[PDB]
Amino acid sequence: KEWERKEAERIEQKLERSEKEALESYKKDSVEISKYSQTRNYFYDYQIEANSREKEYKELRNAISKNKIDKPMYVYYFESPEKFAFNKVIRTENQNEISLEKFNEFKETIQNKLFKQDGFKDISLYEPGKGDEKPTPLLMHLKLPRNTGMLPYTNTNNVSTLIEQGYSIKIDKIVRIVIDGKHYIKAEASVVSSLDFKDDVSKGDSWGKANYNDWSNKLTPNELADVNDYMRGGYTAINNYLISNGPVNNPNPELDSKITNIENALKREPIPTNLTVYRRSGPQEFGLTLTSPEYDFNKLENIDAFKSKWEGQALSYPNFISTSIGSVNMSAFAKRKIVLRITIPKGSPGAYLSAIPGYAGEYEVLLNHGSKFKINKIDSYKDGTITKLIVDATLIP
Amino acid sequence: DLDTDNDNIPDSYERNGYTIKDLIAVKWEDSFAEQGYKKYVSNYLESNTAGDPYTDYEKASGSFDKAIKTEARDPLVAAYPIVGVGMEKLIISTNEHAQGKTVSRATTNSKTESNTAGVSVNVGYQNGFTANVTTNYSHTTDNSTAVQDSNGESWNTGLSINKGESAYINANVRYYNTGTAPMYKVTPTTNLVLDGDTLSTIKAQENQIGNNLSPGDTYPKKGLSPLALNTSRLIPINYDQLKKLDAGKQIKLETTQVSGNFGTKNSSGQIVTEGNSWSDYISQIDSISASIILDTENESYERRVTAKNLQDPEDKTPELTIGEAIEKAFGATKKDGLLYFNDIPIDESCVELIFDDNTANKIKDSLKTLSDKKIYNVKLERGMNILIKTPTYFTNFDDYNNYPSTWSNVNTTNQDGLQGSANKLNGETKIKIPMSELKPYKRYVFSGYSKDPLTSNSIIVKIKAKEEKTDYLVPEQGYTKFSYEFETTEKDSSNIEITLIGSGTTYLDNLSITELNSTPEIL
Amino acid sequence: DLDTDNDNIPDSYERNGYTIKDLIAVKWEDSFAEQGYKKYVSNYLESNTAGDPYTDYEKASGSFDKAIKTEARDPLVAAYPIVGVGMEKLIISTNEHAQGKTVSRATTNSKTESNTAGVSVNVGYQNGFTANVTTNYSHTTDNSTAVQDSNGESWNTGLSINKGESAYINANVRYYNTGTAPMYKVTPTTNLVLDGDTLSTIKAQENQIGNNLSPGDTYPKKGLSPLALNTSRLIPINYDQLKKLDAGKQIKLETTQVSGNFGTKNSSGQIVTEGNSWSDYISQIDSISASIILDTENESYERRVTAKNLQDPEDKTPELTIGEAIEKAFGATKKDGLLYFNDIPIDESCVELIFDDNTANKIKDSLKTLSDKKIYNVKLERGMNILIKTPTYFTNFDDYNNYPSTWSNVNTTNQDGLQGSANKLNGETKIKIPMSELKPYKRYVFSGYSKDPLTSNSIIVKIKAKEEKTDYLVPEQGYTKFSYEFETTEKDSSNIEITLIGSGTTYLDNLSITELNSTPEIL
Amino acid sequence: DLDTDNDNIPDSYERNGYTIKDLIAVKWEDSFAEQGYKKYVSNYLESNTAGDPYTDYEKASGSFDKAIKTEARDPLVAAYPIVGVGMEKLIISTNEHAQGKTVSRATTNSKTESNTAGVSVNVGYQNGFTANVTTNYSHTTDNSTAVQDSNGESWNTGLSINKGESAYINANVRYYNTGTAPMYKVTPTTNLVLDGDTLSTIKAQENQIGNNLSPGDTYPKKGLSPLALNTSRLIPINYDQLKKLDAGKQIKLETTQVSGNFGTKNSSGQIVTEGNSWSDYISQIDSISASIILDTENESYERRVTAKNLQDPEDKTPELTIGEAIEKAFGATKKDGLLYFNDIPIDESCVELIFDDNTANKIKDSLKTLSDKKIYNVKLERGMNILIKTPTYFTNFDDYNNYPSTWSNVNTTNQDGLQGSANKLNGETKIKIPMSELKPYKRYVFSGYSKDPLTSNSIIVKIKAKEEKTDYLVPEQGYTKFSYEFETTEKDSSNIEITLIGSGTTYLDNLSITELNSTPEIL
Ligand SMILES: [Ca+2]
Ligand SMILES: [Ca+2]
Ligand SMILES: [Ca+2]
Ligand SMILES: [Ca+2]
Ligand SMILES: [Ca+2]
Ligand SMILES: [Ca+2]
Ligand SMILES: [Ca+2]
Ligand SMILES: [Ca+2]
Ligand SMILES: [Ca+2]
């Protein structure tokens, strides 16, 4: 723990008054500020501006964005299995042996998949041993890449590492080791970073306009004309055509040419990056109704049914998908309890539709019809007393 | 399932069964006894079940300082080390620099002799007490001197000290450890004591030895040069103690204060021996454990074992007998009613037992309630001292027969022995052990066991030596234990012979000759 | 799928197969042994298979210090450094500041003299024991010096010492490291002794020996001037030991307490030797390893070999034979029953073996159980001492021969030998070995192997030297080893004559001349 | 694309292409070879390609200290420190504090003196080995002393020493660096040895020299006042070595131990030299790297280049020839089949190579499978030494002729030479060289190349000097190297004539006069 303390008092002498005040604020309120940094971006922008913990969040986040490192590191931590989409226990605190079948099922749940890390978190740099806090058998051993936030900071006679994780991790492999007589899972993982904007949306708008100022020039008149029909009112008709299985039941060649033009226009300029985007979804996209008992997430068994029904499955959207780069709550979808957090790899068809002037849309990305989303994580938060879900999904070929 | 201490082992697995395999506790069910494994008991009311700085689990897993001997794997014993200091050659010089009248003599060191120096034997041993009572107790720390290479010559002759001023002394010293623990940062303070008067205290500091003293190893390893006291510098003497070396007295040595460190493995790498002290555990082990010394003629062993006080039902601690405590503290193989080492037989009719006055009184109090008439089925309590003196010669008319001189009239066609057979007699029995293997200026005690299936069959014995002695013994139906003592003289003496004459019906068993101490030399 | 220790090796691989390539550990399948890839073994109970402060895979991968000898990359071979001191020439001067009388004598230093001095020789060797014993065992830490530039003259003539006042002794010393480990913070304490009398001790501290002493080189780098004892400054001497040195005895030097640190990698960048020490591992590694010494006439090595403890099935540690252990600890090319170094061939019928008494007892116990009756196919045990002496001359009527003269009446055209060819005899065999090729005043053993399928075809041999002799050896059906010893004088003497005659049927092989010790010359 | 070490360079770009440009690595296509980037090849298993305290990225990108010579930009050459002491003047003074008698003598220093002193020069060269075998190999650590103003005069006949008390010796020293490493905490030690006898040890401490010693310069900045042995006080001598200094022997001053540090770039600003030193990277370098020395007659250089051991297929280290190793060690411009320094050509025919027994034997053994029979086409191995000496005078019958005199009968109009043109021999070819521009009391060697397109043509070469000689030469169709030595004498002698007479058909080329060592003077 020598290097963590050394860099802790190296950073601490260049931390100013409000930064250090936010540092003791995280020292006394680590869990609450951590969960707030996890779930703050889904509230209203004015809820953010009036939030008491938002000042601490932005001070700590700026400190994380200014204390960087030039080389990748390996760090060890213990985190709940519920945080990494494993909704069961492998071995308990009194249990010390892990059988082959539970190792196999944990392997097949963690295989070939990505898991998000968001918010503030305190992490030790070295492998915990005899007397260190080992609450779970899941020892995550992560390779943080270059230019990633890294804060050694001393609390009383101990030292920890505050970071603002905003990245997904790909667990390359796991092993079963014996520490203090107990079977622990040591997980070698790789950080996969994503272009996520959360609440800062003006600069995301600038990026989309810079990447898509010439997009309307690249489209054919059929494709550009059908897109212009689409955002100005034809989205309702085209989505009603596609959702009701139009080309199969009662095929409309005009609407078939319309959706072909929309797909071609989305295919003209692929997105040059992997993105994290927020779509405000309703119950009908999940085969449910507003009056259905499962929509009321204020009770926990509805969330359990949501986990049992939708986690590990593929969500099919036969219509074009409208997504918003801003996670901020809006008056249009305040009542909706589903905010789908979608990850999109490189080269996918689509467009940032707000680059075209004259549209009153708010930072919208269009996605091709018939898409398949892989459900990965479902967190929860409290918009007031209304319990809402955070469905972190992705785009899969 | 239920846990009390800072240990992983359950309460049921801390009692009447203890098996620790692949760092996992399991109950002993007695099907893996012959596969080299052993069962323990450790306390379920304290993490440190013994006085050592090691809990039961780390001391039973093998997870401790590996320089500690394997005899401390059981949780019963504590890692208690002892520094003893001995001397070999004394040189007397009359200068403060080095020229002068210098005389050099070789002298043998006796570790465990003063504990059994004031012991008296009896012709018949009453009741079931087959031991001897001592008047004082001494550990392996003290070390006595016996001068051997000394022809007829006064010590003042070699120095020519006339009226007022005698010479200076200088010695060759060596350091030994008799204990199952290593110390590194040695701070040995010793005192060169003269029959109640102290000449000098020697501090060997840190540079003369170093930060390494392995358990059971002399500071010069096997055969090298002794460490001279020429590397707090010189020790004087007057013309009052110079003449007291001559007649009866032997100069002794006693270490007083010793401190050190014990190696503790860290979380990742190497053992830390800097931030430590062997001073917070001296009263931790000394006040709770017992003391057992075993004196082999080649080496000495000292052990401390945790026991039970009988007048306290609150303290839930393991209960130990005598023989089980010896087997646990030393490591022994269990033959049919027999406890064996790799070559050393230990039994109530095979070794000499020395007890202090209070412990002998306790045992005589406890020997009444036993219905088996044995000395090893005695419960162990806090605050005893045990001396087990292995005889230098012992026969039992069995597989063990190590006598360099053959007997006479040997009849082994019998079966009414204490173990194996009993020696049938027809007439005399002659033994003639030569001076080539008797150490001069010593005292030897021959003890034996007899049976006699006749009303008034009696025997005579003659110990023909420099001080010969005749004796008349009346054996009984059961096993009677008898002990006789004799001395010897220098190399120019004749062989020592033992003649025993019975009448053809008495039976002899377990005949052992042992050495006790040194006699003063006329000089 | 399963691993145990603080290491990356799987538990299933770690027994009976071990290969490291491109920093991955793969099993051994006996297919790439000729591409420089070799198998090892590792203990799956601890992260440190050896007693080193390094793990087994990391020390078997090369990701550590390169100054260590590369045959120590085997995880079963641990790093063990030894500091030795060697005197080169002696100067005696009568002034403490430096006029007066100053004499100088030229000496040569040898490493294995006291161990060999306790070894006796015999004409024939009974049963499978084809070695001898040493009286006391010592390593190459102590050394013995022999003066070549000393004709007949006493030291008193050039010093003029009458009654008590003597001169001052100065010596030229060098420091060498014969082991597979370095040390940096060298603080050696060395006693200068003569038959027990410790003359003085010297600390070289830091300013004279340097902040490094790499393995494979002494303190002067190849040929430079040796260190003089003028920079703790001088040591005194008296007129009671000079004639002792003059008659038979010699000055020996040995170090006692040596300080030093070991190198290791840091987290990211450089390497640090500040928080390390070669002082807390000695008691760990000597109590867990055996000891092997090899003494070629040019250079010597000594390594510590961990073995398998026999009387514990729980301790799952691999077992070793003798020759496999020697090959892995030193590095020797393995031809068909052949272990060859870069130049020195080592076998059982090519070198000399020195044991102590305990090794002889244990090897006579374990050697009877072998059905092949060979010395090397015996399972190795903990803490056991072996020494190998390379003969200065060895011939076998085969590819190897390093003799000063050419053997007479040689008939190599044979196949009935232990190693291919053997010398068929039809007549006398002669050699005339000169004093131009031999050091003065030494003790030598010529050994050989005689074989004849005939009854009593007796052989006589005459060794004409300064101690000339004749001997007779009868042949046997077995392959019988004979060893003879002799002495010489200063190099102005004639050729040594070796004459031997049988009866033209007997066969001889493996004729080796080796040195043992220095005879005490008369002066 | 795949990266292993902790550097920006991927492993695919760590072999066969390595472009450091604007602090990024990109791939060669052989287009910007004249735009200023030399060949870098680095280990893709080792981040530290060499034993230097740097990764391969930092040393190949300029992100290190400015005082390091830029020749260590290539990752195969390690920045290895060499510190040498130069001798300028000697004074003999009979006092100890500083009236008295004092003489002063001027002394030249020779760096590569003892390395080439054991070079035995034969008249005919075997196979393609155009190099000789030195007996001993020595680097530029030691320095040799030569007296120039050695008029006929005993050193004692003016100093007036009668029996026992000899005078004292003072001198001035300079501290240079021949290598690519700056020393900051310069604390060395050196021995002043006359013909084996050590006189004294000298340490310059820290404040007397300063906090920096750059590569390639001395503490006296070029021509300034030398630092004497006054500001560890004065060096005595006895009445046994003055005749040795006078008659045949010379004072050697050898640097024994070098202690120093370096300054590395921190994250913020300039170098930091507190927590790092030159203490452990020496053995890392010399155990993996060879040693290549250049001695141009103005100044010398030494470099350590990492090499390959053949018995290691996992060792993916770069492999080079001799000439490629020389070019990367020193830096040379490559034209068509030839390499050049700023003014010094480099070839196996222009500058001469010296190897010890191991390197010469390895080059002889490795030349058997080659078909070109050239020196520089030998693969670089570890543990081998190259000493390249540059001739003090060389002509090639071409654009280069540094001979101060003009030859006789030079016929440049020819084309069948190794390089350019050659002299068509017609009759006598003569040159004279004055004694003024040749160093007195030294040994010179003249070497050259001959061809004869006939059967048995012959040349005679007469060297008229103070040992004038005539040598016979029988050339053949193949190219013959001829090399003859002679000794120089004082300035007041005649000139030296080099004459050669042939039949008028042979061809001569590449004539080189070199100084090798200094001859002792009778005094
Ligand atoms: Ca318990
Ligand atoms: Ca317990
Ligand atoms: Ca019996
Ligand atoms: Ca393992
Ligand atoms: Ca291991
Ligand atoms: Ca042979
Ligand atoms: Ca790479
Ligand atoms: Ca690299
Ligand atoms: Ca030519």
Residue numbers in the entry:
A (entry chain Z): 28 to 424
B (entry chain C), C (entry chain B), D (entry chain A): 218 to 315, 319 to 451, 457 to 748
From the paper:
CDT is a member of the Iota family of protein toxins which also consists of two homologous toxins produced by Clostridium perfringens (the Iota toxin) and Clostridium spiroforme (C. spiroforme Transferase, CST). All three Iota toxin family members are assembled from two polypeptide chains termed the “A” subunit (CDTa, Ia, and CSTa) and “B”, subunit (CDTb, Ib, and CSTb). All three B subunits are presumed to contain five domains that are involved in regulation (D1), oligomerization (D2 and D3), and host recognition (D3’ and D4). Once proteolyzed, the mature form of CDTb forms a large heptameric, soluble structure referred to as the prepore which binds one molecule of CDTa to generate the toxic moiety, CDT.
We also uncovered a subpopulation of the CDTb trimer bound to CDTa but note that these particles are present in a significantly lower abundance, indicating the CDTa bound dimer is preferred. Still, we were able to generate a low-resolution map (8.15 Å) and assemble a model of the CDTb trimer bound to CDTa. The resulting structure illustrates rotations of Chains B and C of ~4° and ~9° about the central pseudosymmetry axis when compared to the apo structure, respectively, that allows for interactions with CDTa in both chains. This results in an orientation of Chain C that closely resembles CDTb protomers as they are arranged in the symmetric heptamer. (G) The relative orientations of Chains B and C within the trimeric intermediate shift to contact CDTa, resulting in a structure that resembles that of the assembled, symmetric prepore. Similarly, the reorientation of CDTb protomers in the assembly intermediates bound to CDTa suggests that CDTa may also induce toxin assembly through the stabilization of the heptameric form of CDTb.
